[PDB]
Amino acid sequence: ENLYFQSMEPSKYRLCIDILEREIRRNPTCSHSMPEDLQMRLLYLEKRVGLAQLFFPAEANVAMDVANVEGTSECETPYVQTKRMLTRMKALMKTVETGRRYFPSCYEVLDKYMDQYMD
Numbered sequence: 001e002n003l004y005f006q007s008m009e010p011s012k013y014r015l016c017i018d019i020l021e022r023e024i025r026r027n028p029t030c031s032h033s034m035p036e037d038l039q040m041r042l043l044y045l046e047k048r049v050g051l052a053q054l055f056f057p058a059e060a061n062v063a064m065d066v067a068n069v070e071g072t073s074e075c076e077t078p079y080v081q082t083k084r085m086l087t088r089m090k091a092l093m094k095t096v097e098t099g100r101r102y103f104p105s106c107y108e109v110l111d112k113y114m115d116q117y118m119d
């Protein structure tokens, strides 16, 4: 269906997200480092971004729109299957980096929460 928005809200939001995405390609302290093991890094990112949506739905969904998470699938030829996981990991990571940059007070809450899994 096609709807007429005289205030162009959907389109204004798309321009904002694009300004946020661009403003980081160009141009809050954390308590731990993410796992170096790539499988564990993926699992860590899935848990953290999933918690961001539960604790901070609007902030999370802004960061995920900046990161383009909506294309990706949660965790055919193996080349493209693994590229899917890599693409998912890149977007989860960009979500976290966007939260760190624009929602620092959310990031510090999620940083203390994820520290409990780190040791």
Ligand SMILES: O=C(O)c1ccccc1O
Residues within 6 Å of the ligand: 048, 049, 052, 056, 059, 060, 063, 064, 095, 096, 098, 099, 100, 103, 106, 107, 108, 110, 111
């Ligand atoms: O993971 C975070 O620290 C975070 C913070 C705000 C929004 C999205 C996020 O993933």
